[PDB]
Amino acid sequence: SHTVKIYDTCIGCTQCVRACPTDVLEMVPWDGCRAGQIASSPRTEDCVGCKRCETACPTDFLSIRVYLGAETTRSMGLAY
Amino acid sequence: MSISDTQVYIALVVALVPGFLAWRLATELYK
Amino acid sequence: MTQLTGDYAASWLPWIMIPLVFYILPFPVFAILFLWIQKEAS
Amino acid sequence: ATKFPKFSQDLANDPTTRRIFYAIATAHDFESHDGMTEENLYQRIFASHFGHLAIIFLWASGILFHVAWQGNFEVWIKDPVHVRPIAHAIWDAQFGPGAIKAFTQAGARNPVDICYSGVYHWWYTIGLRTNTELYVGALFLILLAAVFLFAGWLHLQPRYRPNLGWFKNSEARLNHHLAGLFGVSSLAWAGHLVHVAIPESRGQHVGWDNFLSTPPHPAGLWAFFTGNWGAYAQNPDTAEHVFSTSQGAGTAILTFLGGFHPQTQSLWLTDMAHHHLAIAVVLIIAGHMYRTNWRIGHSIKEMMDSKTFFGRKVEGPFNLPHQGLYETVNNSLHFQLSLALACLGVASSLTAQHMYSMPPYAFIAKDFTTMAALYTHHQYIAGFLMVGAFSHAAIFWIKDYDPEQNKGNVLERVLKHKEAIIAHLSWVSLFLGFHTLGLYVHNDVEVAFGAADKQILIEPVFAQFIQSANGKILYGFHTLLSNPDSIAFTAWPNHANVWLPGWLDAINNGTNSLFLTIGPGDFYVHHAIALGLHVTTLILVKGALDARGSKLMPDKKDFGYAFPCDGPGRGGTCDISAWDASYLAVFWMLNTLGWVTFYWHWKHLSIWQGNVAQFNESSTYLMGWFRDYLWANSAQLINGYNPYGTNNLAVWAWMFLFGHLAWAVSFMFLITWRGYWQELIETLAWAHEQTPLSFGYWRDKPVALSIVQARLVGLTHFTVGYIATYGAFLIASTASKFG
Amino acid sequence: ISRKIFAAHFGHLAVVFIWLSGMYFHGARFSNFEAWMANPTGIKPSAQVVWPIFGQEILNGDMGGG
Amino acid sequence: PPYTFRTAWALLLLAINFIVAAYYFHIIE
Amino acid sequence: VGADGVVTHITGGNFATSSITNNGWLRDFLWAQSTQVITSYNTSLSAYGLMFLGGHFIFGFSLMFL
Amino acid sequence: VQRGSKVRILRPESYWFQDVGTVASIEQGGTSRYPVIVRFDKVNYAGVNTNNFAQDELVEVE
Amino acid sequence: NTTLVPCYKSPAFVERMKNAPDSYYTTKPLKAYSQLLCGEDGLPRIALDRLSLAVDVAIPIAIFLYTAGFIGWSGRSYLQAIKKQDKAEEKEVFIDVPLFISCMVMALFWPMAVIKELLAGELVAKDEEIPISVR
Amino acid sequence: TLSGQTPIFGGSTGGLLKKAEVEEKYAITWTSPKEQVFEMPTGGAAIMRQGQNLLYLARKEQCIALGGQLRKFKITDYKIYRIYPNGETVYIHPADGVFPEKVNQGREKVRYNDRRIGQNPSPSKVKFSGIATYDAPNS
Ligand code: F6C
Ligand code: CLA
Ligand code: CLA
Ligand code: CLA
Ligand code: CLA
Ligand code: CLA
Ligand SMILES: CC1=C(/C=C/C(C)=C/C=C/C(C)=C\C=C/C=C(C)/C=C/C=C(C)/C=C/C2=C(C)CCCC2(C)C)C(C)(C)CCC1
Ligand code: SF4
């Protein structure tokens, strides 16, 4: 149960969604970009916290923040 | 002259007073 | 000397309380203190 | 979803083992617990201070009870130089005959511990002579601890629980703490000294059934109110007075000779009573400074916003904008806690720097191991308080600081140039380490190749000027209390240096630690110490001023105080939090006080063993620190138990090796990091599930402990191994050469 | 890739041969090997003498045989 | 602008510093 | 070996009795046998004294990075 | 602020706060809220030298 | 300080001369240590008395601070020499040694160069020229 | 529901543990045109079948680790299910039937802040309040 907030500085480069190993992010239509897209995080209980989405965001001081919060059984990735 | 045999036990029961007053306060601070 | 003794008054009292607070009481205490940290909030 | 911990909900639903651990380390951060209001916060701060004061009093009653019960205070007090104080008894049911015999020491008939706290010297000076006086002190402190456990419980009842306005009444608390908590208490202590300690150092027994009848002075209660105050210092103790007897004793109770008692080599008790009396009056006067509810006094809030200096336009106090600081300090508990720790960290360094040079207690200068442990104790305590003063500076910046109220004030001007401050601590640290290590290892190389005359030896001629400006005639600067014809020496208009013949007799005597003789070896360590205090300030100041964030992660305030990192992106952000600068500065704090106390110990170990020329000729190069201090003085520590026997240092030899293990196991938590251990625990969790007859199963999943926790678990072992190793060294290397 | 491996080994063997040459050269003209052949008990083996600068001539300790 | 309050508080502390050096160098008594 | 056949070892049977406690390793091996590198200044072994301190610096210096 | 002009950044969260960069292109849609693409001579941290900005936190230097 | 006396009159230091080999190192230097303020242990020392050593606690300091600034000035002036060339990215990895030498000869008279850097208001960058963090 | 033939795999040690049938379990279902071999996310190698393939994995990251491997075999028809222990099977990937890199209509901006990250409020503003600085309904 992390918190992946997306800010208005996205450019719809789509790179944050590809890096996510757990499919938390996905693109929705938007208008504040030439791409007309913005990241959204509908599945954040699945967020593992790897911040691999933040490494891919190219906007300077990146538009997507993982906010490591209450860690549960699927946000810590336990197979046992 | 060291303290007598009984004076040790007097301290034992006297120190039982702050022993319970610690329970008074630890549980009142909602452990 | 070849024994633990006490010149101090009530020298029998370390004889029983050093075993008590150090290897007789803690396992009851660590059990009580275990039952408290692992109780359901139902 | 377990009940524990009840203060935070989202940690109670943690399915792993980190919730047992994080509950321990969050249990006192009341401002972050779930469902906490500011009103409820202070009322739990207040009530847990009562629970803390009682622990100090129950700890203090344990000191008294065990020397009353198992100490040798009666035997010790008849010869405080040649017999060792007993801490308590030993009951280890697994000693052999060699440890019973070895630890049956200091005139005891059972295994005992030698007290290295100095409480024997403290109680002997303040007027305690019988074991029963110690016992009723122990019983009184138990009951005094009871009335604070009750008071803490009392002030959580709704009818007695204070309101938020009472806590934020800063002017009323300062008025009482200055006037009553410090002023009256030190007035009361001068009452004990005048009535009990001073008379009982002259032989007469003053007790609770006695003190109401016998006045402490022949002119009691009347010389004071008439104004004939000089009657209290007519005939003081002579130089041939011997302690706790009537021979050589005087009648003065408030006299200001200065210097040391020639027989105990401590400060005069009459000189201390006059001290706390003067401190009390100054403190009580200071406590009538702030208005409470009588419209005569000061208002701290208005002393901030004031911008008029006798009609001249100024920006504030000292022509610096302090507006909004009252509401900043008053609402911030971490600002207040940071200031309190910084002021105890100075008062605890000042305790250590003064109680070795100016021994207050009787015969404590002749108990080297007690004298050595007391210094190292309070300097290490002061180092931690200095780290925590700067820790809570970093919490203050993150949580309870805003740019709105502090717009344009003195606090916001610091952040405007936080990089000018950090760059300059970086310069001084770089300057002081290049030219202190470089000057030490130049001296190493020259001594190594025989040319010990080619060492660069810089006489510390500025500190030697201080000593000459205080009385030391050894060097020959011949100025300003080394010059008997100067304005300062004589005080020409009044000639009221009643304190000067006694002080100059003490500073110019070489048998005490008051203003020790200073040489080139002392110069170099004071730059190691200066380098130490600058880097650990650099780490802490960098961590406080970058707590709001810097270009590597400009949003640190959102992530809190103690977070691991911000991932491997942007190059990698390990140890980026403000917490990791407090963690990184504990290493430098321990290191720096491992130079302060190493230098204090070796300098005194050369004076105590008479081999002063060993420190002066070999502290200028680093091998001398390593051969003549560590290798030389370890010899009797490590032989505490050999194949051929065991002696009274067998426990110090064991804790010395205990602290080496606790230090080494710290490197495990500090070098190897979390994800290694999770892949190994994941494997052990596989093994447990797949094996027969193992009927237990984890209620909460075993995970490798977190990133910011291992940094804390490894910092605890480094600290415990730093303190057990040096505590065992310092005790055994001092209490084996000597008594 | 394999052509780089095989060619880099040759430049490595060159480095070992430079180092082996340095051992025999020092044993040739900077050692007491002649003295140590006569009495290999009381003479200590020593190559790599030290230049007289910086006071480091003290490292040229006595080896037996002057 | 000419610094009038930073100066005369820096030059004041140098003054105290130069007095200390004056006794240090055995100049004034 | 003397003129009878008995052997006087360098530390003299020290391993059997004192290498079984790791306090014996610290005093009978590390403290005892470092006498030659500790007391090595102003002698020909002076450079091993500097390397012995040099190694201590680099170890402590490594912990900055670790 | 047209293409080719050296411009200064007034965005405190940015790596290039109070540093100059050349404008690479301007977006003429007018509905993108960060039309300016400005290019920098210093990469920020393991990455880019290009970032999108609005009209109001830029000031031209030449 | 008066505890320090010259090694001329120092019993602990003539003893250093007595048991001294020569070889290159303990005669030619050790005669020159006879003019130094010498402690009560026969070890030359650096004291700060008055005009007696006011020139000798200025020869090392003037020689260092000049050549430290000389390294700093030539290194600084070579950096701006290539920032203006717009080639400073690779001008630094591949040192332009004719330019660097010409920046060293500018750094011989660097103390008078820094003054006219300062007096022109050109040495120090203005505060809102400088990349900073959020603060 | 879910069905398919399991790949040729000799069984591993990295597979499902007691968390599989107690908390929940994942299933990736894909169709392959060829009988080739793929790397198991739980260590090893398995031969994927000719028709409908079904594989049970302990956590979702393994399934999308394997799904990212299937795109290197030019297979983009995989579906990831989540099997609760009581037995019902949810469809979780791709949630709308199209892959999340693609943009649909009808998806909503969820956890979107309409401000720059730079002007998140200071922690003193939300002092002793339920929210954090990053939810912060201002702007
Ligand atoms: C119950 C529970 C349980 C069980 C049962 O049931 C178990 C079991 C197992 C088996 C099967 C195996 C083998 C065994 C042996 O060999 O050896 C021993 C050990 C022990 C520990 C032993 C133990 C046993 C039991 C516990 C006993 C009991 C005790 C008592 C009861 C206590 C007392 C009480 C009071 C209160 C205190 C194991 C192991 C391991 N562990 Mg394991 N456990 C467990 C627990 C635990 C905990 C808590 C921890 C943390 C510390 C751990 C850890 C670990 C590690 C590291 C490892 C390893 O290495 C190993 C392995 O992997 O393989 C391979 N683990 N495991
Ligand atoms: C005379 C009235 C009085 C007295 C005696 C006290 C006493 C105390 N108060 Mg209280 N308080 C008062 C009025 C008073 N208060 C009023 C009117 C208010 C309303 C605003 C408060 C609100 C208040 C709060 C919120 C708290 C206290 C607390 C405390 C306790 C302090 C903790 C402690 O004991 O540490 C030690 C005591 C010492 C004297 C230590 C002395 C050593 C110091 C550190 C060094 C002194 C050296 C000196 C400063 C040197 C410089 C002198 C100079 C001349 C050079 C203490 C017993 C704390 C508490 O609750 O504890 C349970 C606390 O949380 N008070
Ligand atoms: C190396 C530095 C150093 C030195 C020389 C000392 C020396 C001393 N300390 Mg210590 N202490 C230090 C650092 C040091 N301290 C630090 C950094 C802390 C903060 C944790 C403490 C906290 C502390 C406490 C609470 C007490 C002392 C006490 C003492 C005195 C008696 C113990 C003794 O005989 O010496 C032995 C040498 C040692 C290194 C042992 C010191 C005692 C340790 C540090 C206590 C650790 C507290 C621990 C958290 C609680 C134990 C857990 C418990 C549940 C079992 C002695 C003068 C006692 C005292 O006040 O005298 C009456 C005492 O009550 N100190
Ligand atoms: C905190 C002060 C303190 C400390 C550090 C000690 C320490 C010690 N005591 Mg104790 N004791 C104390 C106070 C203290 N005592 C008081 C006030 C009394 C009067 C009743 C006693 C009476 C007493 C007896 C009869 C004996 C000891 C003994 C001992 C030794 C073995 C441990 C033990 O069994 O004790 C047992 C504990 C008690 C009897 C009660 C003491 C608990 C005190 C009152 C409060 C301590 C709680 C503390 C403040 C909270 C911190 C907990 C946590 C935060 C760390 C040990 C050195 C034994 C001994 O002589 O060794 C040879 C022995 O048998 N003590
Ligand atoms: C009056 C002094 C004082 C007070 C009231 C506080 C209060 C607080 N501090 Mg703290 N601090 C202080 C001094 C103080 N500090 C000093 C002197 C330092 C320097 C070391 C620090 C550095 C510091 C840091 C880095 C942090 C705090 C934090 C906190 C807050 C949470 C407390 C907590 O973590 O839960 C309870 C804490 C514990 C239960 C401690 C765990 C165990 C410790 C390590 C002791 C282990 C000793 C060991 C067992 C002894 C060995 C026994 C034997 C083998 C020898 C709290 C408001 C945290 C914070 O600010 O929250 C955001 C935070 O991260 N402080
Ligand atoms: C001296 C410091 C120290 C100690 C004690 C350890 C201990 C351990 N390491 Mg470690 N390590 C260290 C330094 C240390 N390391 C450092 C400096 C590094 C940096 C590179 C590492 C890196 C490292 C790695 C990468 C690994 C380990 C592993 C291990 C574990 C090996 C299993 C084992 O030996 O069982 C025996 C336990 C001991 C030898 C510890 C001492 C036991 C004492 C003597 C008995 C205690 C008695 C009793 C229980 C006390 C409890 C009483 C109660 C009151 C508390 C073990 C606990 C390996 C592991 O996890 O194994 C599966 C592992 O993979 N270490
Ligand atoms: C003389 C003396 C002394 C003293 C000293 C002092 C006390 C001082 C000071 C001083 C000061 C108070 C200072 C300073 C400063 C400030 C500033 C502000 C600065 C600066 C700088 C700069 C600016 C630099 C520049 C440069 C150069 C010069 C070159 C290179 C480059 C560079 C850029 C780096 C002593 C005892 C030691 C010794 C003897 C005598
Ligand atoms: S959050 Fe970053 S990676 Fe994702 S669309 Fe926006 S700019 Fe691109």
Short mmCIF file of N, CA and C in Angstrom, two decimals, chain E residues 53-55, chain I residues 23-25:
data_model
loop_
_atom_site.label_atom_id
_atom_site.label_comp_id
_atom_site.label_asym_id
_atom_site.label_seq_id
_atom_site.Cartn_x
_atom_site.Cartn_y
_atom_site.Cartn_z
N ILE E 53 68.52 9.13 0.05
CA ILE E 53 67.79 10.39 0.03
C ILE E 53 66.70 10.28 1.08
N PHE E 54 66.36 11.41 1.70
CA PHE E 54 65.27 11.50 2.67
C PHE E 54 65.56 10.74 3.96
N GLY E 55 66.82 10.41 4.21
CA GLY E 55 67.14 9.66 5.40
C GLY E 55 66.74 8.21 5.36
N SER I 23 76.92 10.76 7.05
CA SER I 23 76.45 10.02 5.89
C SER I 23 75.80 10.87 4.80
N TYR I 24 74.96 11.86 5.15
CA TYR I 24 74.78 13.15 4.46
C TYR I 24 73.98 14.08 5.39
N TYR I 25 73.34 13.50 6.41
CA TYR I 25 72.02 13.92 6.90
C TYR I 25 72.01 14.53 8.29
#
